[model samples]
Target: GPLGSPRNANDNNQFYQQKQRQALGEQLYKKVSAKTSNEEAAGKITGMILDLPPQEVFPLLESDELFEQHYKEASAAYESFKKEQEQQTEQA
Candidate 1:
């Protein structure tokens, strides 16, 4: 039971994500990770784009596209979890 603790998956996921964010600088990762809205993310993206050469920015665009696709899936998972909780609450 100790080895199979309920927190194992969550802790593993959290650790993996922590490492992923560390691949970016910590402050930027923290800011981007903490965003509650797309407008906030867009502002950061715009600022970064403005600071770059067009050539440099193209790779940034590709990175953003990749991040966006995964982020939408992550967002949907949270939304679906919320929906399930609300439905269960309403039933009870």
Candidate 2:
């Protein structure tokens, strides 16, 4: 409830989800950048090429999922906001 409080808890949750997504995306990008650089330094330029195991990759990919989930959540918020605006305009 910092900037213009949400109409409901769901709205607030959606906002939180969007922020979480952004954070995850930033984390994922950092991981991928580090891994890519490591691989390049090792002269690796192909598939399934990682000095690390799936556990490491999994966490990085989980960030991708978080980013995707956030996209969906933010999209839902936009749609809901649009619908609300339309309804209010109609009432007016």
Candidate 3:
């Protein structure tokens, strides 16, 4: 059972504390991932966006500042995942 288990490392973490916040974040992630090619990328961006206010969230979505801020980690993962998918398609 998940009641208490040392094997499950992620049962306790900073992310696990943000239930409602992550729920709203994932909703935006769903909409963005639906239009984009990378779900993981959208997920990374969504979690960061949840830290912002309603007014800030709207403009960030419409602009490119968010991507600029997270260019290294988030976009690198996005592009890396993209290439992996392409390689999979090519091999099969």
Q: Which prediction has the highest TM-score against the true structure? A: 3
Clashing residue pairs found in predicted model 3: none
Q: Could you tell which candidate, 2 or 3, scores higher by TM-score? A: 3
Q: Which residue runs of candidate 3 sit more than 4 Å off their true CA positions?
A: 1-37, 79-92
| Residue range with the least summed lDDT across 10 consecutive positions in model 3 | 54-63
The true-versus-predicted C-alpha distance at residue 54 of model 3, in Å, is 3.1
Q: Which candidate is the best by lDDT?
A: 3
lDDT of 1 by residue, 37-73 (tens): 4443434444443343334434444476644543444
Pairs in steric clash, model 2:
none
Native-referenced Cα lDDT, model 2: 0.41
| Per-model CA lDDT versus the true structure | 0.44, 0.41, 0.54
Q: Per-residue lDDT for 1-92 in model 2, tens only?
A: 55697654535344445555555444444443443443322222112223223344345446656434533344455445544555445452
Against the true structure, what is each candidate's TM-score?
0.27, 0.25, 0.35
Clashing pairs in 1: none
